[PDB]
Amino acid sequence: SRYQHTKGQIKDNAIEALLHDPLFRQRVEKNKKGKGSYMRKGKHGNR
RNA sequence: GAUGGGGUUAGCGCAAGCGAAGCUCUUGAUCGAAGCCCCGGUAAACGGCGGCCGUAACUAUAACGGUCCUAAGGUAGCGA
Numbered sequence: 001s002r003y004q005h006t007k008g009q010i011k012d013n014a015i016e017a018l019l020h021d022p023l024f025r026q027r028v029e030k031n032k033k034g035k036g037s038y039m040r041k042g043k044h045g046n047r
Numbered sequence: 048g049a050u051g052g053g054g055u056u057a058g059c060g061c062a063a064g065c066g067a068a069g070c071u072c073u074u075g076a077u078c079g080a081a082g083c084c085c086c087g088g089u090a091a092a093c094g095g096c097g098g099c100c101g102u103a104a105c106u107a108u109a110a111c112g113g114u115c116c117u118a119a120g121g122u123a124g125c126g127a
């Protein structure tokens with residue numbers, strides 16, 4: 001099962017190259033309560 | 048042609064010599080323009096239009112950066 005290498009024709013280091021493409025992104029939690037937190041409509045919504 | 052330095056000298060002295068005046072060879076003081084230097088301009092005047100090193104999500108490149116040098120570092124376009 002392939003991954004479409006955003007980098008393409010990988011010549012030198014495969015690991016490093018991959019780590020520098022969308023597959024190993026910087027992933028950020030959308031936490032509640034604080035900063036970058038507010039949701040207009042919740043997961044289940046207002047009742 | 049300023050001065051200075053001679054040079055033979057009417058001579059005077061008993062004489063080494065001083066060497067009147069004048070004569071006269073020099074010395075170039077001063078006077079003294081253009082140009083040159085110098086200041087600015089001009090490249091459709093003649094001409095000239097850089098190096099070295101480092102750098103970005105594999106690699107590669109380097110928009111970018113450091114530095115040195117220049118009068119300035121080749122712009123548009125074009126380009127084995």
Ligand SMILES: [Mg+2]
Pocket residue numbers: none
């Ligand atoms: Mg050919």
